[PDB]
Amino acid sequence: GAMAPSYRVKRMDIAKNDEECVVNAANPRGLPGDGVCKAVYKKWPESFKNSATPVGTAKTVMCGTYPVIHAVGPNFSNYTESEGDRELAAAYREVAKEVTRLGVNSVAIPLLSTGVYSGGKDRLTQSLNHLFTAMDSTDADVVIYCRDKEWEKKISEAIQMRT
Ligand SMILES: [Cl-]
Ligand SMILES: [Cl-]
Ligand SMILES: [Cl-]
């Protein structure tokens, strides 16, 4: 547990994170994928041994002693808005269980289902609110990683709003 558990946001590649573990925005088949998933594959390829897991779940695989939590958000191209929302909330709840089980003091996390799984919609607020619902009861320092300058400002505002 962190002495004063916090949320922060950084605009940079999550493969360069300064946290005790990382959450991959994984596909269900444990494939290298694109975006965050391909950066994670290049940095921690050993963590993709038996990383396949269903939508709405998280599966942790160690790269050395460094934990990679593979979290599979829904692809909103394939899911209804209702069932996709349920699966996206569930994936973050499994991330909070894994972060707790590992006993880490810090975790690097991307916004699940906001890139090529977004079904072409802006899901910043939907994804970030499910992240908060899951992670608020954990005592890890959470550092959210993003790539877009306007998203950084909006995530930072949402964090500061709760204080
Ligand atoms: Cl970078
Ligand atoms: Cl995505
Ligand atoms: Cl982004």
Residues with CB under 5 A from ligand 3 (ion): 146-148, 151
Determination approach: X-ray
* Contact status, residue 22 vs residue 44, Cβ threshold 8 Å: yes
Residue 27 known to bind ligand: yes
Q: Which ligand is nearest to the CA of 13?
A: 1
**CA 86 / ligand 3 centre spacing (Å):** 22
**CA 109 / ligand 1 centre spacing (Å):** 15
Q: Which residues contact 74 (CB under 8 A, 6 or more apart)?
A: 55, 56, 83, 84, 87, 88, 91, 113, 117
Taking the C-alpha atoms of residue 132 and residue 109, their distance in angstroms, rounded to an integer, is: 11
Residue 139, number of CB atoms within 10 A of its CB? 13
Buried b or exposed e, range 52-83, using 16+ CB within 10 angstroms: ebebbbbbbbebeeebbbbbbbbbbeebeeee
Give all strands (DSSP E) within the chain, no chain letters. 7-11, 22-25, 58-63, 66-71, 106-110, 141-146
Q: Which ligand is nearest to the CA of 24?
A: 2
**Exposed / middle / buried, residue 19 (Cβ in 10 Å: 0-12, 13-18, 19+):** buried
